[PDB]
Design an enzyme around this catalytic site. Structure first.
Site, mmCIF file in Angstrom:
data_model
loop_
_atom_site.group_PDB
_atom_site.id
_atom_site.type_symbol
_atom_site.label_atom_id
_atom_site.label_comp_id
_atom_site.label_asym_id
_atom_site.label_seq_id
_atom_site.Cartn_x
_atom_site.Cartn_y
_atom_site.Cartn_z
ATOM 1 N N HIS A 19 35.921 44.934 37.046
ATOM 2 C CA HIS A 19 36.473 44.251 35.858
ATOM 3 C C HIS A 19 35.751 42.913 35.605
ATOM 4 C CE1 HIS A 19 40.047 46.561 37.293
ATOM 5 N NE2 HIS A 19 40.054 46.910 36.012
ATOM 6 N N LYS A 43 56.360 52.002 34.402
ATOM 7 C CA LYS A 43 55.267 52.235 35.395
ATOM 8 C C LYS A 43 55.630 51.375 36.623
ATOM 9 C CE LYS A 43 54.614 51.492 31.089
ATOM 10 N NZ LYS A 43 53.220 51.204 30.683
ATOM 11 N N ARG A 92 33.711 54.829 33.616
ATOM 12 C CA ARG A 92 33.182 54.946 34.993
ATOM 13 C C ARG A 92 32.761 56.394 35.227
ATOM 14 N NH1 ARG A 92 34.967 55.121 39.101
ATOM 15 N NH2 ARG A 92 37.153 55.564 38.576
ATOM 16 N N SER A 130 40.920 50.127 40.660
ATOM 17 C CA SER A 130 42.131 49.450 41.201
ATOM 18 C C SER A 130 42.844 50.412 42.189
ATOM 19 C CB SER A 130 43.053 48.969 40.080
ATOM 20 O OG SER A 130 42.472 47.930 39.304
HETATM 21 O O1 LIG Z 1 42.636 48.055 34.152
HETATM 22 C C1 LIG Z 1 42.777 49.064 34.687
HETATM 23 O O2 LIG Z 1 42.343 49.104 36.034
HETATM 24 C C2 LIG Z 1 42.321 50.487 36.322
HETATM 25 C C3 LIG Z 1 40.863 50.869 36.044
HETATM 26 O O3 LIG Z 1 40.364 50.150 34.863
HETATM 27 C C4 LIG Z 1 40.057 50.552 37.301
HETATM 28 O O4 LIG Z 1 38.973 51.504 37.222
HETATM 29 C C5 LIG Z 1 43.380 51.018 35.389
HETATM 30 O O5 LIG Z 1 44.139 52.062 35.753
HETATM 31 C C6 LIG Z 1 43.498 50.221 34.299
HETATM 32 O O6 LIG Z 1 44.220 50.366 33.180
#
Ligand SMILES: O=C1O[C@H]([C@@H](O)CO)C(O)=C1O
Ligand SMILES: O=C1O[C@H]([C@@H](O)CO)C(O)=C1O
Length: 163
Positions: A19, A43, A92, A130
């Site tokens: 990020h 969530k 990604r 993350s």
């Molecule tokens: O911001 C984010 O972090 C993760 C991803 O972007 C990390 O690859 C995720 O689920 C988002 O919404």
């Protein structure tokens, strides 16, 4: 010669070196960047909004054209409220690409002014997410290489306490 304002929405749970790379890259191309941290009511983020904002401000506050705000609701309502030029997202993997394509088209139908631009990660961050970082920290692994030092400490302090 109108001012550009892009939103980078995410859970940032927690922020990673990937990020940081994206937001730095974007801060060179647009006048204003908003790191928009999705609260996630229905969530279950590991880190609270306050922790996520502080961790982001600690890695990115050195960039003068970057702001940090929590949001919930419809991304297009936030887009309109913020008067944004565009939403930014990183791609990604292929599943990222397919989902993001679908979301851009759905958002364009809810708001014709909507726009989404994408960045590709540098290869040194292409394998960082993350979710994976959470998994390694939970199992007592070292995440120092993938996240800013303040995130390392926040994982130690989450262990230390219990919430
Ligand atoms: O911001 C984010 O972090 C993760 C991803 O972007 C990390 O690859 C995720 O689920 C988002 O919404
Ligand atoms: O905030 C920080 O940036 C680097 C990190 O991005 C590399 O893992 C680091 O270690 C910090 O102290």
């Amino acid at each position: 010669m109108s001012k550009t304002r892009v939103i980078y929405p995410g859970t940032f749970d927690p922020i990673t070196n990937g990020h940081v790379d994206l937001v730095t890259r974007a801060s060179r191309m647009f006048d204003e960047v908003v790191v928009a941290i999705a609260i996630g009511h229905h969530k279950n983020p590991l880190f609270s909004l306050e922790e996520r904002v502080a961790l982001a401000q600690s890695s990115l506050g050195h960039l003068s054209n970057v702001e940090f705000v929590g949001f919930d609701g419809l991304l297009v309502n936030f887009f309109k409220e913020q008067k944004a030029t565009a939403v930014l997202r990183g791609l990604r993997a292929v599943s990222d690409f397919e989902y993001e394509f679908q979301l851009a088209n759905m958002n364009r139908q809810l708001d014709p002014h909507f726009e989404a631009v994408f960045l590709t990660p540098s290869e040194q961050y292409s394998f960082i997410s993350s979710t994976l970082i959470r998994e390694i920290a939970r199992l007592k692994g070292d995440v120092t290489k993938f996240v800013p030092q303040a995130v390392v400490e926040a994982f130690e302090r989450k262990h230390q306490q219990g919430w």
